[PDB]
């Protein structure tokens, strides 16, 4: 049928910021995940039309993807690291909620999440 509008990657009314933690999220965390062999299905919003998932956006009401996260980081959309971490967690959780356990897309998300947790374990202070 139709996809929703994608999550915003900028907003004129939302205060913008750069912190060293946000810089680390973009240059270390996002970059490491983006190049992973399993990253590509997560590099843009789920196209429920092209993927023939007519119920995807009936079930997933807070969609999130790494393409959106990357642009948010590039645009200084976030005020703090927690906002960005929340977006990553939402992306993984959506995949686990929508898809059958043990599906390939779930295994891909699980591998990306393990790597994500490894990199955020070293998030610098401040």
Q: Which stretches of the chain bind ligand 67B, using CB under 6 A?
A: 41-42, 46, 51, 53, 95, 98-99, 105
d(CA 66, CA 87): 9
Look at the alpha carbons of 46, 50, 53, 57 in this order and tell me if their dihedral is positive or negative.
positive
When the beta carbons of 48 and 81 are compared against ligand 67B, the nearer one is 48
Residue nearest to ligand 67B (CB): 41
Among residues 92, 113, 90, 122, the alpha carbon closest in space to that of 21 is found at: 122
Shortest distance, position 44 Cβ to ligand 67B, whole Å: 8
Shortest distance, position 12 Cβ to ligand 67B, whole Å: 29
């Amino acid at each position: 049928s139709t996809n929703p509008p994608p999550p915003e990657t900028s907003n004129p009314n939302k205060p913008k910021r750069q912190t060293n933690q946000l810089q680390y999220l973009l240059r270390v965390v996002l970059k490491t995940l983006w190049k992973h062999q399993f990253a590509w299905p997560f590099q843009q919003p789920v196209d429920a039309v092209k993927l023939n998932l007519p119920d995807y956006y009936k079930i997933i009401k807070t969609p999130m993807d790494m393409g959106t996260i990357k642009k948010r980081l590039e645009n200084n959309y976030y005020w703090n690291a927690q906002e960005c971490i929340q977006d990553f967690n939402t992306m993984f959780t959506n995949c686990y909620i929508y898809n059958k356990p043990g599906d390939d897309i779930v295994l891909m998300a699980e591998a990306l999440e393990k790597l994500f947790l490894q990199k955020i374990n070293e998030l610098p202070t401040e």
